[model samples]
Target: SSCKRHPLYVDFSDVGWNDWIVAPPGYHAFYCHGECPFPLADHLNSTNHAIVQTLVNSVNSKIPKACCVPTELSAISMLYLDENEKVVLKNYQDMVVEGCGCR
Candidate 1:
């Protein structure tokens, strides 16, 4: 909303997860999976919480209001929280942006 963009431009990778996970009403979260799109379409974005945040922000900045899925909207935002509501990092988080030459 800050960049006049949608949250669908970003892509977080987990293995093949959805874009966003509804924690509840009015509450959205980011998750990653193999379906996530990398900057170059080659690489994976970690599903880590921080990574998810980054992806969401990137999408919001790059392309907001990506699509219309019924009354809801589709964004790059995607998440996998444990029972304790803790983000699980697969220990493969990228130190830099995906498809960025593995910076």
Candidate 2:
């Protein structure tokens, strides 16, 4: 509730599939599929978790007192975290702040 900035934002820096089994790789998430629901059940699963988080953050950030339905929120803040023990080497400030900022 204090601009925690989405857990993923503090943890990772990007977005991508981890096990694929847990989050597949197509539709059911975002751009891949169609229908988008409230309490956005599908978005919380995984896959598009980042997309959902970022989207929700951006929206809520823009509109004061407004927020996403889940409230829990999640995803890779821009630095993907696949379970391969792989690291995405990147700066959150540049990739996130500069990239997703208005100024």
Candidate 3:
């Protein structure tokens, strides 16, 4: 299968961070997991480097194939405790995966 974003929930409590974060119990922090085969499709959102690498790997078995990773990401707002024991509300980038591709 091609690279894609899969459903994944990240719970602050599970990671022992619930004591600091004061908000949602968890979030849909989707992940990327799939094959980055040779000649990636256009929908995979592959980069020029990946396209060249994929072509190279097709001929040479020693070269590694492109990796599947997050291509597009979205941010999330979070309320958490700061080091000075202050509640801080901030926007965190790259917290959620919106798309995946070969890299």
Candidate 4:
């Protein structure tokens, strides 16, 4: 099978951060996991660089295969208590996984 994204719920409370965070208890911060096989398919969202790297690796085994990682990401807003014990709403970028691809 090819590399793909999977569900990964990250609960701030589980990590013992609930004391500081005051909003949502958790979030669906999905993850990517799988093999980046040669000749990556279109659905894998491979990049031009990855394609070339894959080809190069096939020719020379010394080169490593393209890595499967997050190709797209989104953000999340969190309400938390700051160091001064003040409540603040902040927007955090790249907090959630949107897509995966070879890189």
Candidate 4: tens digits of C-alpha lDDT, residues 1-103: 6788999999987899989999879899998888888889988888898999999999997999988789899999999998899999999999898999888
Could you tell me the lDDT of residue 33 within candidate 2?
21
Candidate 1 yields a Cα-based lDDT of 0.31
In model 3, the clashing pairs are: none
Local distance difference test, each candidate: 0.31, 0.32, 0.89, 0.89
In the range 4-58, model 3's lDDT, one tens digit per residue, is 8899999989999888999777899999988898778988999999999998989
Model 4 Cα shift for residue 35 (angstroms): 1.2
Q: Which stretches of candidate 4 lie over 4 Å from their true place?
A: none
Task: Give me candidate 3's TM-score against the actual structure.
Answer: 0.93
Off by over 4 Å in 2: 1-32, 42-44, 51-103
Runs of candidate 3 with Cα error greater than 4 angstroms are: none
Please identify which of the two predictions, 1 or 4, would achieve the higher TM-score against the true structure. 4
| Candidate 1 C-alpha lDDT tens digits along 1-87 | 111112222223342333333322122232222222333222322335434544665768664322211222233222446677666
Question: How many pairs of residues in model 2 come into backbone collision?
Answer: 5
Instruction: Give every collision pair in model 2.
Output: 13-77, 13-78, 13-79, 14-78, 14-79
Point out where model 1 deviates above 4 Å. Answer: 1-47, 62-103
